[model samples]
Target: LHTQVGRGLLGAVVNPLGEVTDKFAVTDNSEILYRPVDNAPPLYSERAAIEKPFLTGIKVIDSLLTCGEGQRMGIFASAGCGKTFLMNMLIEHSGADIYVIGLIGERGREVTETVDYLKNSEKKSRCVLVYATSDYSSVDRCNAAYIATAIAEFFRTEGHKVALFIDSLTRYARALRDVALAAFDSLPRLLRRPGKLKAGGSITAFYTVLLEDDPLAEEVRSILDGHIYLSRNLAQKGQFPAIDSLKSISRVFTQVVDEKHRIMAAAFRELLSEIEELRTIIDFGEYKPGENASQDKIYNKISVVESFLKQDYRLGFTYEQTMELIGETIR
Candidate 1:
């Protein structure tokens, strides 16, 4: 049995050679079927409205973010690296109408702390807390983040600048690993797996998020941002906090400023670059506990950068102009 269908209708036929033919076929027994090229009218579909940008209040960080009118930014840090404090400050400072939904995966105390802080905040009405921490399977942790994302989406749909802060994305990833292990037992046996090997062993994962603009660092870049990192010098000095690695700190502001302020931005970047180089030179020699000329250089560079930033560059300044000024100063 053979069938032929055209743009409007269809018909069937029977062939002894078990062949089929179409309108464009050259021979009667030809199997080739040609489709007519048709230029159809373009169809339009309504897209989800973009959310407005929320001010983080932190001048340095906000300047780098340059977040779009309506975009989401993710805050990430280690367990006790002041991430919560930073998020709270951002919530307090953001002038736009914001709705914060906190998803506490493991730490009940931390969740309680966040809720208490929100309750005491003057903008408590603007913020909403979603607590899903309880004795449940690891899958629940993963769901918590999704639930938080969904809540942010809901608020965004309502035309609000929703800044969703997931205290720790690491916990959420662990939950996913746990669920994955439960579903696929072979995952544990696989080499280089992130979670524990046993059926119910603990999983270690880091928390992170995908932000609109690439403001914050990720992976290795994130590691370099650590304020306090292990160092042989620190170990020798009996300092647990060890070396204060300012090199990891990022001075870039993802949002807030425009490209026209290139001079201001370049000045900031150049000053930081020089400061980092000096710091590296000082740290390369014998370990010293107390501050010295190196410390003075750091402060001097910082002062110079701060001074440059206060100039009329905000009103008007090109990249070339800023570079020329920097050259003059250095010369």
Candidate 2:
């Protein structure tokens, strides 16, 4: 049975002949019997509209715009806005039952770093990193991102919550655009719209897109459950994971958030908003008359929000740890 490729060799570090190599999984096999291709439908016959909050490890993220199970979330930015770093931080702190990461046409350095990180992380058994790095041929580069997504949905439909992280589809879409232009309708185009991949155990996908009204960006924003826009200005100021809270949104907020948590989060957000307003005035070395007491209160809130958002991606936290941390600081 082991003479050639099959399901029995999951997590094995060998080829069809069973030689040692890098870590891998059953779903990564190029050749298989009776398995469907990249866009195959799931085997399960039923599903519900149910979902739970997919807690992102970031303090502000979980408090304000929580990623929910089966939700399609996106991060937007130009290059150098810390989108990839935030992506890795989310993965590092994710509590999902399954994780699928796609490295499609991204830098070779990013691919190497991600592969290395997953290798040492505690959840490798439940995580799969599918890559078609920039080094791959044009054909593979175009196909890789979706192939990784299909694998993610496979895990999703099998009664495990899956966190799908596609480091980028920007280049993959470009590759597809090339074919579409050259071949007219003779070949399917590289992009245009994304759809629900599976019903359950849920696919909580996070995609990264550029910060413009290009067709790709527009389509992705339209399709996702939420999007966080990273700020280049904040990044330039050395703010880590510099997500622009005001520009970000989560469509799943109403469905997943509870009244108590919502009340608490509302207060936190209001404070953050007030802090921004105050910081703006104070940055120019000016304060309005008779606002000293309010200014002092706002300064304290600013420090707390600052401490909450500051992080070292290397740090690990359990579900309990994250929950307590979010509660304590906000309270």
Candidate 2 lDDT over 1-331, as tens digits, reads 2222223223433211223245643345443322232443333344344247878777667767877776777888998787778887887787877676767777678766776776676665666666665666656655555555555555555566777777676766665666565452211221211223344477777888766536547666776678998888878866676877778888888677788777767776777788888989888889764668888778776776777666677765554565566677666
| Candidate 2, lDDT over the whole model | 0.64
Off by over 4 Å in 1: 1-53, 184-256, 284-299, 303-331
Quality of model 1 by C-alpha lDDT: 0.39
> Could you give candidate 1's per-residue lDDT for residues 1-331 as a string of tens digits?
1222121111111111112221111223322332211111111222222222234444333332333333333343333434555456556655545443535464556666766676566566555454446455665554444444443443343454445555445455556566776532221121111111122211111223322223323542333212222234433544322222232232223333455444554555565677667668667874353567655656466555444333221133333454445444443
Model 2: lowest-lDDT 10 consecutive positions: 184-193
Instruction: Judge candidate 1 at residue 179 and give its lDDT.
Output: 75
Error of 2 at 27 (Å): 12
Residue pairs with colliding backbones in model 2 are: 156-200, 156-201, 176-190
